[PDB]
Amino acid sequence: MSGGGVFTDILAAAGRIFEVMVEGHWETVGMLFDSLGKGTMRINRNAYGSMGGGSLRGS
C-alpha cells in the first residue's frame, strides 16, 4: 500500500463519496428535471410528431 495502493483507495473513496454524492444530486433532479423533463417530453413528442420525422427526420 505504498505508492498507488492507498492513493487508489483514496480515489475509490472519493469516487464513492462523490458517487453517493451524485446519487443525491439526481435525487433532487426529480424536481428541477421534472420542470423540463416531464413536461418537456410533451414538447419533444410534439416537436417530433412531425418536426422529428418529416421536416428534419432527425437526419
Give how far the C-alpha of residue 19 lies from the chain's centroid of Cα atoms, to the nearest Å: 12
Residue with cell 495502493: 5
What's the CA gap between 30 and 52, in Å, rounded?
Answer: 26
CA 44, CA 51: separation in Å to the nearest integer?
9
Flag whether 17 is marked binding. no
Q: Which residue has the cell 483514496?
A: 10
Rounded Cα distance, 18 and 26, in Å: 12
Contact status, residue 41 vs residue 33, Cβ threshold 8 Å? no
Domain boundaries, the chain: 1-59
CATH number, span 1-59: 1.20.5.950
Q: What is the DSSP letter of 59?
A: -
Is residue 52 within 8 A of residue 58, CB to CB? The reply is yes
